[PDB]
Design a protein around this ligand. Structure first.
Ligand SMILES: *[C@@H]1O[C@H](CO)[C@@H](O[C@@H]2O[C@H](CO)[C@@H](O)[C@H](O)[C@H]2NC(C)=O)[C@H](O)[C@H]1NC(C)=O
Ligand SMILES: *[C@@H]1O[C@H](CO)[C@@H](O[C@@H]2O[C@H](CO)[C@@H](O)[C@H](O)[C@H]2NC(C)=O)[C@H](O)[C@H]1NC(C)=O
Ligand SMILES: *[C@@H]1O[C@H](CO)[C@@H](O[C@@H]2O[C@H](CO)[C@@H](O)[C@H](O)[C@H]2NC(C)=O)[C@H](O)[C@H]1NC(C)=O
Ligand SMILES: *[C@@H]1O[C@H](CO)[C@@H](O[C@@H]2O[C@H](CO)[C@@H](O)[C@H](O)[C@H]2NC(C)=O)[C@H](O)[C@H]1NC(C)=O
Lengths: 49, 70
């Protein structure tokens, strides 16, 4: 949650979480603007799920 | 850091990399090695307006065209 996937390859590197989720969308073929303009929706959907 | 940069009322997002600030100026870097470059219109792409991104910051994005045309 605080370091993403960096602590498993060396030192833990902090990065804000909203920016971690944007990287993770990029890794599946979705552009990052789709998350940042819908951040509230994805957080609501995750919390209910 | 900041997710996007505002210029001319438009939101700019990095193609690859993250925005960083050294204390006084902002740069674009690649994510795996610190190597800053100036934020230009060839480094970024535009999507949406600066009203939906939380944490967007003001900066200058330089266009190479105008200083070539003096
Ligand atoms: C994408 O789908 C979601 C539902 O999966 C839509 O969000 C819902 O919208 C309805 C109608 O406004 C609301 O009553 C619900 O409360 C919303 N759900 C959540 C979890 O927020 C969303 O509007 C859709 N997006 C678009 C652009 O149509
Ligand atoms: C952040 O980096 C910049 C660029 O290196 C520093 O700003 C100065 O920028 C001018 C050009 O606009 C250069 O001619 C100077 O040599 C730069 N100074 C230095 C010390 O590099 C700026 O000082 C840096 N900020 C901090 C807080 O270190
Ligand atoms: C990050 O969190 C800090 C608090 O830990 C936020 O700082 C506050 O900002 C508000 C305005 O948004 C001020 O009214 C408060 O006085 C600030 N608090 C402190 C302790 O200085 C900061 O805004 C947050 N950053 C983002 C991008 O949301
Ligand atoms: C970033 O720059 C924009 C553009 O100058 C700022 O938008 C202005 O915001 C002020 C209030 O702070 C309004 O009075 C102006 O009408 C706005 N200008 C326009 C053209 O809409 C924005 O506030 C700046 N952001 C920060 C954090 O300073």
């Amino acid at each position: 949650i605080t370091s993403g996937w960096t602590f498993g390859a060396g030192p833990a590197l902090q990065i804000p979480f909203p920016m971690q989720m944007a990287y993770r969308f990029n890794g599946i073929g979705v552009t990052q603007n789709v998350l940042y303009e819908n951040q509230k929706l994805i957080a609501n959907q995750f919390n209910s799920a | 850091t900041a997710p996007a940069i505002c210029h001319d009322g438009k939101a700019h997002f990095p193609r690859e990399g993250v925005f960083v600030s050294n204390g006084t100026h902002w740069f674009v870097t690649q994510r795996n090695f610190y190597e800053p470059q100036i934020i230009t219109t060839d480094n970024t792409f535009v999507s949406g307006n600066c009203d939906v991104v939380i944490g967007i910051v003001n900066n200058t994005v330089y266009d190479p065209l105008q200083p070539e045309l003096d």
